[PDB]
């Protein structure tokens, strides 16, 4: 009974990884302290503003 | 105009 | 001033660049069926076309050690 | 026309931050008896206030292997 | 958001 | 035996490294049109050739990951 399915409101994304073969977010949820992973494509649709917040901070300009 | 450069989002797997 | 930004009322096509040199983050927005791109505040673009911004960042992923 | 920068003509106190997000490196310069700090091109501060630049770097230096 | 973030000068102990 | 150091009278080319080892900060200075490099006190290099000092530190400024 895991993942996005728990029905918690997402609070913030703390890291991301594609090593499973898909892009995944470590989602911390509001009013729970067990954080699990979510599919990036799903997060885009369900909490786009959380995703923006995660990506936004990590922006840099390279040579 | 000069800030029209690469524009990368830095992401790491160092957690887990 | 007269005719800038989102006020031109076109639907946004893609973000072609971004800059924080002012003091706030802005995207250089290319709009559909126009070929002169202008700047928009990131806060606005985040709320008005959230998938375009998510799409902009998704192409630009990098991995650090 | 309001062109505050190194041109503001006030005397520098210390460098309080730095950023190279634009293709060029800039110091956030604090001025004497003012509380408006602004950005200056690093290449200018290197030539105009060399000890202010060197002072910024000496504090903040660390050692790697 | 490197401004407002403390900057380090990384100096090597052995060489350059 | 003092016949060495800044007294070598050559023009400074670049700084090769630095060390807190003698308890005081020193730059290993390479001199122009020579390939014998020796050590120089930091406080002297700041005052004598600040542009060489600044160039050395600048190439190494960072914000990390
Ligand atoms: C080049 O891409 C570029 C980007 C942003 C800005 C310039 C060049 C420039 O000189 O003006 C900047 C700008 C652009 C749009 C906007 O609405 C405000 C600003 O403000 C600004 C302020 C400073 O201090 C420097 C540059 C820009
Ligand atoms: C400012 O917007 C900004 C963006 C991204 C990063 C920094 C500042 C920074 O100092 O760390 C960066 C970062 C952030 C998160 C993450 O997971 C990795 C990295 O990696 C990284 C690498 C380099 O070379 C520079 C900056 C960052």
Residue pair F51/D50 in contact by the 8 Å Cβ criterion: yes
The H-or-E segment that residue A25 falls in is: strand A24-29
Residue D44 buriedness (CB in 10 A; 0-12 / 13-18 / 19+):
middle
Q: Which residues line ligand 2 (CB under 6 A)?
A: A 57-60; B 10-12; C 64; E 1-2; F 63-65
Strands lying side by side in the sheet with D61-64: D61-64, E8-12, F61-62
Chains B and C lie in contact, requiring 3 or more CB pairs less than 8 Å apart: yes
Q: Which of E11, E14, E15 sits opposite F60 (nearest CB)?
A: E11
Contact A19/D at CB under 8 A: no
Rg from Cα positions in chain D? 12
Contact D21/C at CB under 8 A: yes
Resolution of the PDB structure in angstroms: 3.2
Chains B and E lie in contact, requiring 3 or more CB pairs less than 8 Å apart: no
Contact F17/D at CB under 8 A: no
**What are the structure tokens assigned to A53, written together?**
């917040």
Angle between helices F50-58 and D50-58 (to 10 degrees): 40
d(CA A55, CA C54): 8
Could you write out the three-class secondary structure of chain D?
Answer: CCCCCHHHCCCEEEEEEEECCCCCCEEEEEECCCCCCEEEEHHHHHHHCHHHHHHHHHCCEEEEC
Residue ranges per domain, chain A? 3-57
Q: Which class in CATH covers the domain with range F6-58? A: mainly beta
Residue pair F34/F10 in contact by the 8 Å Cβ criterion: yes
What does C5-36 look like in DSSP terms, one character per residue?
A: GGGG-PPEEEEEEEE-SSSS-EEEEEETT---
d(CA D12, CA D45): 9
d(CA D22, CA B1): 9
CATH number of C5-59: 2.40.50.40
Cα(F3) to centroid of ligand 2, in Å? 48
State the ligand closest to the CA atom of C27.
1
Nearest by Cα to C25 from C58, C53, C52, C62: C53
Second-level CATH architecture of A3-57: Beta Barrel (2.40)
């Amino acid at each position: 009974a895991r993942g996005f399915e728990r029905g918690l409101e997402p609070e913030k994304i703390i890291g991301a990884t594609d090593s499973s073969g898909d892009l995944m977010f470590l989602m911390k949820w509001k009013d729970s302290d067990e954080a699990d992973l979510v599919l990036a494509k799903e997060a885009n649709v369900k909490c786009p503003q959380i995703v923006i917040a995660f990506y936004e901070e990590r922006l840099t300009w390279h040579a | 105009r000069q800030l029209s450069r690469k524009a990368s989002v830095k992401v790491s797997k160092t957690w887990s």
